[PDB]
């Protein structure tokens, strides 16, 4: 049955749908169904809500805005914004150092009243640092189960077009991350990627993968 948390969530998502009219209907339908179910789920929860949004280059600004505003919509009943993390801010960096930074940022927020995070540009984290998402995204042993994490992946393709089905979009994201995380892997890091760890990460963050379309009213770079 529907809660006041969900009614606030729906209030905010309705506004988003009205502001961003260039999206696939299934973006809104499937993300709301997924996140409401988590918000409505009984305690104890077994897993955080983990939503993966992706986009091609021609939709970079929509990806950034809609991911953060959907995460804030999840938290609106709590009158706090989602935690913001950005992988473009981490790429040149020592993997173990980045892992400590991400862990501190997420844990500090989640311990102190915040219940969602947006993880922008997940593909740009140094590969080994992304092992921190086992702590936060594991199927049953995650550190905070009563939260949402919205992750984004910005593809290097110029456009997705509107013809792709979700299975093809998911394969694109999976394949692209495998390339990015192999490229940025540093085996001499304490935390380093390997094939089983990479597939395990993919399994834990790919529950719901949705594409985001361009919004010309965003080229401004200011969210609506």
């Amino acid at each position: 049955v529907e809660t006041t948390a969900v009614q606030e969530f729906q209030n905010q998502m309705n506004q988003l749908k009205n502001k961003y009219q260039g999206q696939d209907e299934k973006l809104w339908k499937r993300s709301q169904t997924f996140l409401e179910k988590h918000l409505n789920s009984s305690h104890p929860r077994s897993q955080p809500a983990i939503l993966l949004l992706t986009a091609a280059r021609d939709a970079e600004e929509a990806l950034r805005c809609l991911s953060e505003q959907i995460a804030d919509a999840y938290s609106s009943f709590r009158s706090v914004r989602a935690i913001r993390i950005d992988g473009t801010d981490k790429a040149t960096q020592d993997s173990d150092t980045v892992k400590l930074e991400v862990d501190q940022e997420l844990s500090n927020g989640f311990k102190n009243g915040q219940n969602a995070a947006v993880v922008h540009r997940f593909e740009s984290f140094p590969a080994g640092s992304t092992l921190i998402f086992y702590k936060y995204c594991d199927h049953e042993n995650a550190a905070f189960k009563d939260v949402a994490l919205v992750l984004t992946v910005l593809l290097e393709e110029e456009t997705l077009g509107t013809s792709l089905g979700l299975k093809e979009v998911e394969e694109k994201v999976r394949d692209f991350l495998k390339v990015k995380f192999t490229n940025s892997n540093t085996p001499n890091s304490y935390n380093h990627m390997d094939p089983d760890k990479l597939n395990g990460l993919w399994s834990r963050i790919s529950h719901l993968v949705l594409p985001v379309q361009p919004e010309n009213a965003l080229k401004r770079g200011i969210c609506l």
Epitope: S46, Y134, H139, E140, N141, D196, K197, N199
Partner: nanobody
Framework: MQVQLVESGGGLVQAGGSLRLSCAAS????????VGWFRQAPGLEREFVAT????????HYADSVKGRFTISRDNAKNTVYLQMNSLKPEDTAVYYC????????????????????WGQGTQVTVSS
Amino acid sequence: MQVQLVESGGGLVQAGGSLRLSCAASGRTLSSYAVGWFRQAPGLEREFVATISRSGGSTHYADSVKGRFTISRDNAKNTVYLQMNSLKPEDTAVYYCAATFTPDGSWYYTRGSSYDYWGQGTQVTVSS
């Protein structure tokens, strides 16, 4: 190559008896995987039975089988076991072994949705 699971040890027993299910893993080292046993009878929901961490150090059991069943693993022989004692008709079902990678040696999984690999199942029938 992905890991492959093959369960054996099923069969028919009268209530009160015992069975020992085994699952042999091929293609990958079993020590890579947390392992779970699940069971399903016709028309009913698949049920968690037991689970064991990669190290063997951590286990968990369904309330209905605790004290009767014991999950264990022999990573050297790439095999996992489910000792089933004091069997009851309520235990009749097809039993499946499942495996899933995790980087933490103590973590286990009690939900089937957590598991990537499954065996073909072995029938366990407990007569009344």
